[PDB]
Motif scaffolding. Structure first.
Motif, PDB file in Angstrom:
ATOM      1  N   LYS A  47       0.848  -1.189   0.000  1.00  0.00           N
ATOM      2  CA  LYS A  47       0.000   0.000   0.000  1.00  0.00           C
ATOM      3  C   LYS A  47       0.888   1.246   0.000  1.00  0.00           C
ATOM      4  O   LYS A  47       0.965   1.938  -1.020  1.00  0.00           O
ATOM      5  N   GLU A  48       1.620   1.409   1.123  1.00  0.00           N
ATOM      6  CA  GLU A  48       2.444   2.563   1.450  1.00  0.00           C
ATOM      7  C   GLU A  48       3.428   2.873   0.322  1.00  0.00           C
ATOM      8  O   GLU A  48       3.587   4.040  -0.046  1.00  0.00           O
ATOM      9  N   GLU A  49       4.105   1.829  -0.178  1.00  0.00           N
ATOM     10  CA  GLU A  49       5.136   1.993  -1.188  1.00  0.00           C
ATOM     11  C   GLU A  49       4.523   2.339  -2.553  1.00  0.00           C
ATOM     12  O   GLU A  49       5.092   3.159  -3.275  1.00  0.00           O
ATOM     13  N   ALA A  50       3.373   1.744  -2.909  1.00  0.00           N
ATOM     14  CA  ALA A  50       2.663   2.108  -4.132  1.00  0.00           C
ATOM     15  C   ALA A  50       2.209   3.571  -4.096  1.00  0.00           C
ATOM     16  O   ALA A  50       2.433   4.306  -5.062  1.00  0.00           O
ATOM     17  N   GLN A  51       1.566   3.967  -2.982  1.00  0.00           N
ATOM     18  CA  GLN A  51       1.064   5.322  -2.774  1.00  0.00           C
ATOM     19  C   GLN A  51       2.202   6.334  -2.857  1.00  0.00           C
ATOM     20  O   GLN A  51       2.046   7.360  -3.519  1.00  0.00           O
ATOM     21  N   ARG A  52       3.326   6.029  -2.188  1.00  0.00           N
ATOM     22  CA  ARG A  52       4.514   6.872  -2.223  1.00  0.00           C
ATOM     23  C   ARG A  52       4.911   7.145  -3.675  1.00  0.00           C
ATOM     24  O   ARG A  52       5.095   8.306  -4.044  1.00  0.00           O
ATOM     25  N   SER A  53       4.946   6.090  -4.506  1.00  0.00           N
ATOM     26  CA  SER A  53       5.304   6.204  -5.916  1.00  0.00           C
ATOM     27  C   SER A  53       4.084   6.381  -6.830  1.00  0.00           C
ATOM     28  O   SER A  53       4.154   6.017  -8.000  1.00  0.00           O
ATOM     29  N   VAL A  80      10.661  -7.604   2.918  1.00  0.00           N
ATOM     30  CA  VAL A  80       9.751  -7.073   1.915  1.00  0.00           C
ATOM     31  C   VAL A  80       9.859  -5.548   1.910  1.00  0.00           C
ATOM     32  O   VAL A  80      10.098  -4.955   0.850  1.00  0.00           O
ATOM     33  N   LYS A  81       9.694  -4.947   3.105  1.00  0.00           N
ATOM     34  CA  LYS A  81       9.610  -3.503   3.249  1.00  0.00           C
ATOM     35  C   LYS A  81      10.804  -2.812   2.595  1.00  0.00           C
ATOM     36  O   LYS A  81      10.625  -1.741   2.011  1.00  0.00           O
ATOM     37  N   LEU A  82      11.991  -3.431   2.692  1.00  0.00           N
ATOM     38  CA  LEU A  82      13.190  -2.908   2.059  1.00  0.00           C
ATOM     39  C   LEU A  82      13.118  -3.006   0.533  1.00  0.00           C
ATOM     40  O   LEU A  82      13.402  -2.032  -0.170  1.00  0.00           O
ATOM     41  N   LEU A  83      12.768  -4.191   0.029  1.00  0.00           N
ATOM     42  CA  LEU A  83      12.868  -4.480  -1.396  1.00  0.00           C
ATOM     43  C   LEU A  83      11.772  -3.720  -2.145  1.00  0.00           C
ATOM     44  O   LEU A  83      12.038  -3.202  -3.235  1.00  0.00           O
ATOM     45  N   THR A  84      10.566  -3.654  -1.537  1.00  0.00           N
ATOM     46  CA  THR A  84       9.448  -2.855  -2.036  1.00  0.00           C
ATOM     47  C   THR A  84       9.813  -1.377  -2.157  1.00  0.00           C
ATOM     48  O   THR A  84       9.406  -0.739  -3.131  1.00  0.00           O
ATOM     49  N   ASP A  88      11.332   3.727  -5.220  1.00  0.00           N
ATOM     50  CA  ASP A  88      12.428   4.681  -5.358  1.00  0.00           C
ATOM     51  C   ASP A  88      12.765   4.941  -6.831  1.00  0.00           C
ATOM     52  O   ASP A  88      13.031   6.090  -7.190  1.00  0.00           O
ATOM     53  N   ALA A  89      12.761   3.891  -7.669  1.00  0.00           N
ATOM     54  CA  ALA A  89      13.078   4.031  -9.088  1.00  0.00           C
ATOM     55  C   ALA A  89      11.977   4.790  -9.826  1.00  0.00           C
ATOM     56  O   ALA A  89      12.254   5.458 -10.821  1.00  0.00           O
ATOM     57  N   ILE A  90      10.738   4.670  -9.337  1.00  0.00           N
ATOM     58  CA  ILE A  90       9.628   5.411  -9.910  1.00  0.00           C
ATOM     59  C   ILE A  90       9.822   6.890  -9.574  1.00  0.00           C
ATOM     60  O   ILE A  90       9.735   7.721 -10.471  1.00  0.00           O
ATOM     61  N   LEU A  91      10.169   7.182  -8.314  1.00  0.00           N
ATOM     62  CA  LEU A  91      10.396   8.540  -7.856  1.00  0.00           C
ATOM     63  C   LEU A  91      11.706   9.120  -8.397  1.00  0.00           C
ATOM     64  O   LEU A  91      11.799  10.346  -8.489  1.00  0.00           O
ATOM     65  N   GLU A  92      12.713   8.282  -8.719  1.00  0.00           N
ATOM     66  CA  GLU A  92      13.958   8.769  -9.319  1.00  0.00           C
ATOM     67  C   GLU A  92      13.769   9.205 -10.782  1.00  0.00           C
ATOM     68  O   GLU A  92      14.495  10.095 -11.227  1.00  0.00           O
ATOM     69  N   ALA A  93      12.850   8.570 -11.535  1.00  0.00           N
ATOM     70  CA  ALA A  93      12.467   9.028 -12.872  1.00  0.00           C
ATOM     71  C   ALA A  93      11.464  10.184 -12.816  1.00  0.00           C
ATOM     72  O   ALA A  93      11.372  10.943 -13.783  1.00  0.00           O
ATOM     73  N   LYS A  94      10.690  10.288 -11.720  1.00  0.00           N
ATOM     74  CA  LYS A  94       9.828  11.442 -11.475  1.00  0.00           C
ATOM     75  C   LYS A  94      10.655  12.711 -11.232  1.00  0.00           C
ATOM     76  O   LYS A  94      10.138  13.805 -11.462  1.00  0.00           O
TER      77      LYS A  94
END
Length: 218
Positions: free
Chosen positions: A73-79, A202-206, A211-217
RNA sequence: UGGUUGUCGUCAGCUCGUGUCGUGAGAUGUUGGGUUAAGUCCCGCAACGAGCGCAACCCUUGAUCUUAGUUGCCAGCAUUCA
């Protein structure tokens, strides 16, 4: 990676033998994953994601295992992505047009709450529609925005997500999976050898995918 | 022979679209765990949603309000056999 207990795979007895090219030795009836590969795998995936994000891709994060509900949830929403953390609905993508009816309905029962149609026709009817808003705010809560088909999946424990994986593979959409030692790594396009059965892991790898979505953002 | 009568008249649950599984006939949905008077409802769950039947729809009655007060009503005033 050593930090969280990523290395720590599953039991030896219940393994996939197609996995030992990511396994490095056992201990106490449990295989251990060679993090050297994960280093070079998380690498390729980070790249793969960011090469997909800048195209204009959408990633669905599918993790309905107890260890990966919050992360996804959290990681999808973040990105600013999509997710499923409750139950993957048989035909989320292969029957997408029918799931697009509910992605509507929900938004329309939410509009009835806004405009003001919940003090017009009350009694049985509004209780009904709120309890239906909530069924749709449990199950389609994350793909609520998803307009076109996701262009890659991020699955977690692709043995619990057998049904997600087979929808993806039907539609020839890639799957970046966090695979354990009990996971067929051929289904998954971008393997990420890790423990999925720990929350820290999981929390780390997710995080790194988002991060890669936000790095291209940026 | 039409037509109309008597007489097995509620009594049971049936299906579809899309998806998925199966070479196929098929299956799933609609097998599960509860629950209901129930062909009920909720949770499930490779299904997601729906239709028909049921019930409703039509008529009558119980409470109330608004409109309408006459040929109906008289509480509160004048009359009175009323």
């Amino acid at each position: 990676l050593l930090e969280a207990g990523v290395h720590f795979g599953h039991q030896t007895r219940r393994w996939n033998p197609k996995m030992k090219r990511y396994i490095f030795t056992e201990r106490n009836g449990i295989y251990i994953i060679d993090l050297q590969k994960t280093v070079k795998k998380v690498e390729e995936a980070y790249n793969f994601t960011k090469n997909l994000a800048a195209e204009g891709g959408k990633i669905l994060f599918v993790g309905t295992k107890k260890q990966a509900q919050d992360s996804v949830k959290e990681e999808a929403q973040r990105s600013g992505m999509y997710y499923v953390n409750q139950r993957w609905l048989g035909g989320t993508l292969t029957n997408f047009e029918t799931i697009q009816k509910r992605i509507k309905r929900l938004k329309d029962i939410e509009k009835m709450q806004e405009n003001g149609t919940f003090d017009v026709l009350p009694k049985k009817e509004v209780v009904q529609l709120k309890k239906e808003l909530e069924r749709l705010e449990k199950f389609l809560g994350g793909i609520k925005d998803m307009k076109d088909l996701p262009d890659a999946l991020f699955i977690i424990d692709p043995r619990k997500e057998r049904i997600a994986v087979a929808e993806a593979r039907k539609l020839n959409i890639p799957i970046i999976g966090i695979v354990d030692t009990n996971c067929d790594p051929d289904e998954i396009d971008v393997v990420i050898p890790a423990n999925d059965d720990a929350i820290r892991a999981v929390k780390l790898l997710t995080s790194k995918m988002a991060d890669a979505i936000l790095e291209a953002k940026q």
